[PDB]
């Protein structure tokens, strides 16, 4: 019974910039979902003191994968075999990971060579109000023409399984996939390096005869960076990106979560708040179609979402 383990707490994830991050428990985070590998019960059988280590170098996401345990069942005395935990994980990470912290640390030495993929879209800083540290972030649009992107995306996509309930891996040969990446800049040994923060995949969905309606598919801000404004920056940058294309109608999402809906409401209200069609005097007259029209034309906001924007803003202007 001590040989059944919850895989949501057994799987230990780290993003590593400095050798000491390996021994800092603050750096470790845990899946929200493991049911797609370990079933509805999210349990692995056969091991006491199970640790599934998935450690990633912060930028490149070069991977160390190790399964550790205190003891395990012996089919000779227990008459049952332990679960193939190692095989399950290898189903969703690419080959070539290292298997010990020595080798992982040697890869960390050259992490300065890691550079962000694609075209720079936006840079922003979180400036200290109090004379402390400032932090600097950048958003890129990347694709499979970028050297090393294909392999990096394979390392990255594993994180969707832990954090998006119904995540599936996309067909990267499909040319309608767009990729948006968020990086934090940081210094180490007098150099400047890039840490992966999160990303979004967007499907450039065809609307006959000659338009598209970009569909937000998979969006993830990695645990350590959540609730700090990055998700909002990312969705805003994405809207701003597609706003330059007349052939884009507006932007939607694939089966959005409650938390995504909340995020989207936040971003879209911010974008629309000072538009002429959403003035207080207009809001007080009730929803008008030209609010959807203006939101679509200015920011590629879908009509359904423009209506929510109206509701939220009407509530804001009243008591």
């Amino acid at each position: 019974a001590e040989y059944k383990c919850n895989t949501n707490t057994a799987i230990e994830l780290k993003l590593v910039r400095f050798p000491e991050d390996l021994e800092n428990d603050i750096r470790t985070f845990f899946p929200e979902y493991t049911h797609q590998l370990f079933g509805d019960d999210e349990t692995a059988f056969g091991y006491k003191g199970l640790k599934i280590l998935l450690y990633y170098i912060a930028g490149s996401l070069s991977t160390m994968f190790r399964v550790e345990y205190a003891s395990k069942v012996d089919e000779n005395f227990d008459c049952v075999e332990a679960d193939d935990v190692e095989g399950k994980i290898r189903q969703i990470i690419p080959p070539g990971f290292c298997t010990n912290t020595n080798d992982f640390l040697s890869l960390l030495e050259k992490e300065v060579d890691f550079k962000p993929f694609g075209t720079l879209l936006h840079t922003y800083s979180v400036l200290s109000p109090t004379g402390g540290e400032n932090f600097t972030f950048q958003i890129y649009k990347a694709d499979m023409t970028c050297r090393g992107f294909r392999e990096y995306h394979e390392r990255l996509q594993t994180f969707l399984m832990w954090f998006i309930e119904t995540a599936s891996f996309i067909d990267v040969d499909d040319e309608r996939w767009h990729y948006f990446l968020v990086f934090e800049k940081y210094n180490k040994d007098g150099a400047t390096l890039f840490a992966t923060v999160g990303y979004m995949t967007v499907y450039n969905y065809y609307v006959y005869p000659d338009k598209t309606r970009p569909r937000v598919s998979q969006m993830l801000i990695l645990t350590p960076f959540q609730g700090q404004g990055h998700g909002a920056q990312l969705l805003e940058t994405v809207h701003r990106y597609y706003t330059e294309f007349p052939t884009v109608l507006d932007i939607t999402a694939e089966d959005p979560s409650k938390s995504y809906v909340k995020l989207r409401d936040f971003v879209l209200v911010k974008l629309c708040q000072d538009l002429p069609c959403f003035s207080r005097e207009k809001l007080m007259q009730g929803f008008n179609e030209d609010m959807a029209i203006e939101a679509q034309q200015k920011f590629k906001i879908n009509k359904q979402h423009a209506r929510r924007v109206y509701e939220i803003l009407r509530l804001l202007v009243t008591d």
Binding site: I164, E165, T166, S168, D174, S217, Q218, E254
Partner: peptide, 15 residues
């Protein structure tokens, strides 16, 4: 795993 253009084609969790 999902059909064409889908990234959320996996299983829901049923505790």
């Amino acid at each position: 795993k999902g059909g064409k253009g889908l990234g959320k084609g996996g299983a829901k969790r049923h505790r």
